[model samples]
Target chain A: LGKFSQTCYNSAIQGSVLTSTCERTNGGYNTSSIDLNSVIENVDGSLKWQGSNFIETCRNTQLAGSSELAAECKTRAQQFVSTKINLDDHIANIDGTLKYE
Target chain B: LGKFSQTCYNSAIQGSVLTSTCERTNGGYNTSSIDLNSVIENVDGSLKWQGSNFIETCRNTQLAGSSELAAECKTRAQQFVSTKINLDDHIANIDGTLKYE
Candidate 1:
């Protein structure tokens, strides 16, 4: 409970990136860096479930009584924010790079 | 090849964490933040193959004519260095925090 949560969190992060990469390779985004579409929806949707698991892990760690460790866990939990930004940035670059073609 | 490589890279990152977390929760570390053992070996092993895949992706992207994209990809590829540090830190804290007991 205390530790395994981090594993799930990490996997979810990976899955989200994979989904995004697939979208970019397939030309799913064209409008802008941030696009609202079914592909994007499922992209975030996969992340959402994984994110839920991540939050639950943090809460579990906090209750586990290692206050210092729990604090660190919280910080690790915030990694997703930056990841989301990068993922969005990556998708946005797809059209500009012309690599998949 | 260009895009799917990133997907493999992300999964390898996740797998490494999962292996590390399992070790910590099971009381695998005792000496220091850096341990030389089978568990750690496999942890890095998973990341090693994934990292190779990531490097290949960058090279492929470079050859694909997106020099700018390849440059950016190389930067992103270096994220593993930080991740390894954190994983080591996490395992070290496991013994100090008294959470497993």
Candidate 2:
């Protein structure tokens, strides 16, 4: 169930939910936040960040040749909601863990 | 445990997998042959539709006031697998050229 969630969530978010389902096995990292769960109550909820500035950040990052830009956004969300955020840390240059995941 | 545990997971994943749209509905492409799975499976195992044809569609999308591009990618993926393509990656804000998109 856990491994499948990564595929399902990533693909659904990617938009090719069914095709992504056919994906062999854990193709990549799977990360998200409690905030992301908000989309559960109403899919329209997920659409919020989808249309927010985050999308562009993702696109710009993607142009850099990183497929994990979208996954990273969820990471940032997790960072913000973390027990504490380190201001000294720069958002710039944080490796997309999706690469490792 | 089966039904509601979904709250602990992504609703789209939960809904998509459980829904009659893609996952549960794969067997019912309404009945189309050339079984895409077999094609895409061998089609670079997934790259045949590969984005060779799909990349063009991705680029021509919209630069209009939008931010839901990449995330939108998943939407298209599911439909494409289910029967159509309709998701968008993050756009504008983090907009990148294949760099991230």
Candidate 3:
């Protein structure tokens, strides 16, 4: 799971969530005593950031040479939440090492 | 895991991966008889998408009103695979529904 998460994060989430948030906030670092999880979630229990912002950010990141590639990335990042990846196996891998599962 | 994967997919992976790929391929639909998982991976066991193209696509998706937001998005998407959001709990939800576990 860790490996997969890392792969996903490195591949898309980092650019979509963290980097985007940081840039949006002008490098303020989301320093509002909010937990990392909270930083991503609002009191309403929804994503903290705006979806339009996400879309715009995603659209603007396309390669100049390949519009098709740009479109693919946009779709993948936009639908990230709907088509999530599983990480139970990875978590179990770590937990097992901690206490003899 | 499915929930989280869906969350990530909706949030950014869709925009970053699928959308980007489709656009790059001019709607060819990855039609090389590759399975869904294989569509995401190459025979070499690496992600099939080009990192630079991914980065470019992510970088361009910024909110027009906020350059900071753009930067943040870029970083988040770029590092998505590395930081990785865990989906074990979500995955367990689905698996538990299927069995007595």
- In model 3, the Cα lDDT at residue A55 comes to 36
List the candidates' TM-scores in order: 0.14, 0.14, 0.15
Looking at model 2, residue B56 earns an lDDT score of 23
Model 1 C-alpha lDDT per residue in residues A10-91, reported as the tens digit of each score: 1112211211111123334211111111111111112100122232322222111110112112343343121110111111
lDDT of 2 at B55: 28
- For B1-101, candidate 1 gives per-residue lDDT tens digits of 32322211111122112111111224342211111111111111121001222323222212111101111123443421211101111111122121211
Best by lDDT: 3
**Per-chain TM-score, chain A, candidate 2:** 0.16
- Lowest summed lDDT over 10 consecutive residues: which window, candidate 3 chain B? B92-101
Q: What lDDT score goes with residue A37 in model 2? A: 17
Docking band of candidate 2? incorrect
Ten consecutive residues with minimal summed lDDT in candidate 2 chain A? A92-101
Against the true structure, candidate 3 reaches a TM-score of 0.15
TM-score of chain A of each: 0.15, 0.16, 0.15
Better structure of 1 and 3 per lDDT: 3
Cα lDDT for residue B22, model 3? Answer: 13
lDDT comparison, 1 vs 2, better candidate = 2
Question: Residue pairs in steric clash, candidate 1?
Answer: none
Interface RMSD of 2: 22.1
TM-score of 2: 0.14
